[PDB]
Structures are given as C-alpha cells and as structure tokens.
Amino acid sequence: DPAKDATPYHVEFPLFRSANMASADKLSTGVGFHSFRIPAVVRTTTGRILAFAEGRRHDNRDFGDINLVYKRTKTTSDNGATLSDWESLREVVGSGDGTWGNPTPVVDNGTIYLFLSWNNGSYSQKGGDELPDGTITKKIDTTWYGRRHLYLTTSTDDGNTWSKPQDLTKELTPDGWSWDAVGPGNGIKLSSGELVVPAMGRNIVGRGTPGQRTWSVQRLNGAGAEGTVCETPDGKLYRNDRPSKAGYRIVARGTLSDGFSDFASDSGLPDPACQGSVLKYNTDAPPRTIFLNSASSDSRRQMRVRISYDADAAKYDYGRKLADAPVSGAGYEGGYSSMTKTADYKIGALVESDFFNDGTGGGSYRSIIWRRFNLSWILNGPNN
Ligand SMILES: O=C(O)[C@@]1(O)C[C@H](O)[C@@H](O)[C@H]([C@H](O)[C@H](O)CO)O1
Ligand SMILES: O=C(O)[C@@]1(O)C[C@H](O)[C@@H](O)[C@H]([C@H](O)[C@H](O)CO)O1
Ligand SMILES: [Ca+2]
C-alpha cells in the first residue's frame, strides 16, 4: 500500500456540543439541545461537507421531541479541517413534538437525498417511558398514528436549504410493520448509477438517472434494523449490519438484479450491538473498503477503523484504535459513527461520545466528535 509512505495525519475535535459544554450548539432561534446523537456525514460533489445529527432536546433518549439538525463546512474547499471551517448549527426539520431522526444521506450529482425515520411524540419503541411533562408513552405499533414512518427531504443547493419532508411510508415500508429504521449513516451511488440506501430488512433503491429518480424496495430476509451498504471492488454489494444481540456484525453480499445471500456472523468483526459505518474509499490499485465500529463484543468504547483489500471485503486488517488519538473534554468517545472521503483524500468520521454524568440514564450528555485522518494514520498504527 503506497499510502503508508505519507506522513501520518490526524485531527479531532468536538463538532456537536451538548448543553453542558462551553460552546453548546443551539439554533439561531435560541433553541438548544441536551444531546446530539446518531451522526451522518457526506462530502458533496462541490467538496462541501454536510454533517447531520439528531438534536435531542430534553435528554439523551431515543424518543420524545427530537429535531434533525446539521452543519456544513463554510466553503467547498476547506475540508472541515478546523473548528472555524464549520458553520453554526442549522435545522433540516423539527416540526412537532415527535422524533425526527435516523439521518441517512446519499449524494447524487447536484441533489442530496436525506432519508429519515419519524415517530409520533406520544410513542416509544418499548412503550411505558415517561416524558418530561409526565406523559407515559405508548409502544410503537402497526397503526398509521403509531408506527415508525419513513420520510425524504432533498437539497439542490449544497445543503443550504431542504424541502419539506415527504412521507414515503406507504411506498417504501412494508404494510403492517411497527418499528422501522433507515440507516443511520449513509447511502451510496453505484458505479453503474443506482442509488442504494440501507434500511431495516431492505434496501431502498433509486433507479433512473440524476434529476429523474424512482424509488423501490429490495427486501432482505435476515438483515438488521440498522444496516450499512458498500459496493465492493468486485462490483458486488455488501451489507454489514448491526446484530440483534451483541457479538459480531452480520454480513450479506449480492446484487440489485439477483438479490442477496442470507446474513451470517462475521467472526473477524466483533460488535456490541451498535451501529457501524462502511466506506468505499477507492477503485484503483489497491482497492480499499473502510470499516468503523466498536471492536468489542460488550463495549461501545473500542472504536476501531479498518481497511480491507479483498474483492468481497471478506477480511480486514486490525486497523487502528481511535483512542490512539483521543479527544479531551467532550466525554468518553464511542458509539455510532459515519464516514466520508473528503476532497483532500482523508477519511472524515463523526463519532458519538458520552459524558456518562448520569451513567446509563437519560441525563448523560452526548456529543459528536469530528475526525480527519489519512490512510497512513491507519496503516502506521501499532498493531497493524
Ligand atoms: O443506541 C442505541 O442502541 C439505539 O437505542 C439508538 C437509536 O435511536 C435506536 O433507534 C436504536 C434501536 O433501538 C435499535 O436498533 C433496536 O431496534 O438503537
Ligand atoms: O422542537 C420543536 O418542536 C421547536 O420548539 C424547535 C424547532 O427547532 C422548531 O422547528 C419547532 C417548530 O417550530 C414547531 O414544533 C412547530 O412545527 O419548534
Ligand atoms: Ca420538534
């Protein structure tokens, strides 16, 4: 790998700052957030970077009043290299007291498509949860009013403005589902043109061309609730999903035309039942797939970025622990992540972090770290 020859490079700093932090991120209206979770990042075709998160208004929990917030880099060519290269916090959508979340963007020339999950403010995944006003939630069910919805918003101005989200639940979620999720993290555009957005038990597929996309569903038996997808070097598709119970990632491979294998545990990739991220880095020699998750069967604090050179992404190297370049003052890093390739040939990653001030409870402040590093940084790590 010739990339090893470059001087190793890494920067890291908090980008979404929880309410407890000095420069706590708030909207221009003065609306702030206890916590930020569930990152998604894409570089646009202009080279601008767009970073999305769930703005969790009142506590760190998955339900209640949650707005879909974002930042862009100030210019198309700064690559988010320093804190001062990022705009202040903006909102994609925050209407009502329910949950707007699961950011899953994909870039198509230009247009940015952002798929989202939504639920009503009176419902939660388990039910029986107490909201700040004392209201008790109902469990997410199969009804229209009580199910998880799937929404699509678009930007045709490099993220500056977003269309009113369109509810595509009846079109792109199976009838009779209760819980649902899209991503979270990112979709992909294939070498052959199609858009592929990972979701619970399915891919959401955009055929046609840029400016004239048509969406449909590819069902995937045994896929996770929270999936990732990648075009591997052999031109095939690769789903690398969160398992239903802690242990290992689950993986399937296929195509849009012939469908997917069943899902099987990948014994090379331990996972604690948490979201991960995957990225197609490059197509020429040597081709590389990048993977990032907590490399642990029981902890989310063992973030490890890795590289596979295999045509089918079978096997990864050990890679490097993100703790080798730690951040201070933004909690204990580890959890959900998202990766993009910046216009200056770095990996750009968003990674969750947890102050743990309320332990596992609802009052623990959550922030999101932004990281850039070159392939040399990964490849020159101690156990690679
Ligand atoms: O941090 C988690 O693990 C979390 O709770 C955060 C997400 O907001 C939630 O939608 C997701 C979901 O509960 C699981 O995928 C099981 O369906 O996981
Ligand atoms: O989180 C909310 O609900 C909030 O308070 C803050 C949001 O940033 C804003 O978008 C939203 C909206 O104005 C109303 O919910 C009516 O749609 O008001
Ligand atoms: Ca709201």
UniProtKB/TrEMBL annotation:
GO terms for cellular component: cytoplasm; membrane. It holds the Pfam family BNR_2. Keywords: Calcium, Carbohydrate metabolism, Glycoprotein, Glycosidase, Hydrolase, Metal-binding, Signal. GO terms for biological process: ganglioside catabolic process; oligosaccharide catabolic process. Ca(2+) binds at D65, N67, G94, G96. Its EC number is 3.2.1.18. It comes from the Eukaryota. SUPFAM superfamilies: Sialidases (SSF50939). GO terms for molecular function: exo-alpha-sialidase activity; metal ion binding. It is an enzyme of class 3 (hydrolase). It catalyses: Hydrolysis of alpha-(2->3)-, alpha-(2->6)-, alpha-(2->8)- glycosidic linkages of terminal sialic acid residues in oligosaccharides, glycoproteins, glycolipids, colominic acid and synthetic substrates. Residues 47-344 form the Sialidase domain. InterPro entries: Sialidase, Sialidase_fam, Sialidase_sf. Belongs to the glycosyl hydrolase 33 family. This is exo-alpha-sialidase. It comes from Aspergillus terreus (strain NIH 2624 / FGSC A1156).
